[PDB]
From a paper:
BCL-2 protein family members BAK and BAX are the gatekeepers of mitochondrial apoptosis. Homooligomers of BAK and BAX form pores in the mitochondrial outer membrane (MOM) and release apoptotic factors into the cytosol, committing the cell to destruction.
As a starting point for design, we used as a scaffold a de novo designed protein BINDI that binds with high affinity to BHRF1, a viral prosurvival BCL-2 homolog. BINDI has high stability (resistance to thermal and chemical denaturation) and therefore is likely to be tolerant of the mutations necessary to enable interaction with BAK and BAX, and we demonstrated previously that the three-helix structure of BINDI can be redesigned for altered BCL-2 family specificity. αBAK2 binds BAK with 400 ± 200 pM affinity and 333-fold specificity. αBAX2 binds BAX with 3 ± 2 nM affinity and 100-fold specificity. αBAK2 differs by 12 mutations (10%) from precursor αBAK1 and 22 mutations (19%) from BAK-CDP02. Crystal structures agree with the computational model and confirm the BH3-mimetic binding mode of αBAK2 with BAK.
Residue numbers in the entry:
A (entry chain B): 170 to 281
B (entry chain A): 170 to 282
Amino acid sequence: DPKKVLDQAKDQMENVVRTLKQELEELAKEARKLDLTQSEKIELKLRYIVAHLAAIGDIEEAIREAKEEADKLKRAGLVNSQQFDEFKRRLEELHKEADRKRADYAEEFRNK
Amino acid sequence: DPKKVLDQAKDQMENVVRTLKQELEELAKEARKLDLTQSEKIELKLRYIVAHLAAIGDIEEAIREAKEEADKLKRAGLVNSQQFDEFKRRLEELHKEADRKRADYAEEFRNKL
């Protein structure tokens, strides 16, 4: 069901944004610790960069799995050309609106 | 102007959601203080409940006042029918976005406690 594929992706792309929020808040808590060695300060700064790449990457992997799942329904004959082009049209809308919500939290914790 | 009415509901709901945030943070800080009678803990529970019911109700009455604003522009034919459909679609997206943050703050407060 092409509708189920869009809903499956919006759950995953929201779950990635919530995972990003929790990882940035866990780093903000550890930035306040007064007993950070040299090993742990550089680790926290690089973990901040990875937290963003992992969000960008898991957003793309959610779009990729959704685009592959619709191609299977197309090749099976369960989806016509009118449903296919509609599905990519609304997938880009979910792709761009999740790309903003990720930038909204990233701008929120970058103001520290 | 239908876009103004959408943006009025956004700011009115972000204030509601911010007011819950400020209220819940204050309740979190006063919950940890030692020396609390069995009734003082109940008074905080009571202030929490009212804070919750105010957020739920005011989110609802912001959507309702926006719909009554839209139906008032339709009564005088100031809005096209194709617009009226588009306004309802973006209003409930503002509704889902506001209730998500509201339910987050209440859940974030329950975990910290």
